[PDB]
Amino acid sequence: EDFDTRILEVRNVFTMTAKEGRKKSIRVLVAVGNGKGAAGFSIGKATDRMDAFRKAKNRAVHHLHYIERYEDHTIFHDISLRFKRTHIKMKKQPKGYGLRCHRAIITICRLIGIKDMYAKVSGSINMLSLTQGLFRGLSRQETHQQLADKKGLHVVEIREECGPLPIVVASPRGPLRKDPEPEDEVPDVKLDWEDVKTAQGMKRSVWSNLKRAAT
């Protein structure tokens, strides 16, 4: 009863059979979630639409990923993934930013319990691939505690609204590492051209940052 069920795609699929000519069936992609991290998705094939809904939504709850949410409202870090031919770029956002994401991603994030995140989908926008890649990336994300345990250093949050106050959001479980870590002069990180263009203001898309209803 704590889980909510949402439809993501309803496709009519036909097959060529000698006995019946063109056989018709319904394939339904269903996402379920309890709004507290536990969410899943499933595919239901049936001759009847309601039967497909029932099959998919009853099968989804047996395939529940648990998505870790930072402060119970957002992802822990930016996630860049390419599932098949679908690129998903998720940006961690502060409280109150809302869900500026693909409508399917908006629905899935509502099911998970994410309230603030950005998400851009590029390449193929196939709904099944989009959902699978989104769940893969969200499940594979690394929490602050895991990072602190892995590198044995305090994970400290710096907030502009809080000034120079250092907020220790994570601390290693085991002994702390006294290595002051490498002060990398230049980070060898693969940037995304769209993000740099937006930061430098060269991007002038008439569709970005459009006023939209609350999400």
Binding site: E185, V186, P187, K190, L191, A199
Partner: protein
């Protein structure tokens, strides 16, 4: 993604980080460096990293 190794170099935010602004006397700067040899390694990295910023400033 942005092409090339260390694509951060090709950003305004990185170019503006250069803290070296030459005096008005300086007009030409010649950077003689060796593509190989550990002793010149830093110089190479300098050419790879700080020549843009300097030229931006």
């Amino acid at each position: 993604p942005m092409k090339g190794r260390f694509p951060i170099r090709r950003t305004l935010q990185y170019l503006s980080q250069g803290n070296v602004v030459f005096k008005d006397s300086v007009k030409v700067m010649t950077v003689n460096y060796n593509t190989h040899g550990e002793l010149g390694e830093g110089a190479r990295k300098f050419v790879f990293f700080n020549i843009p910023q300097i030229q931006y400033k």
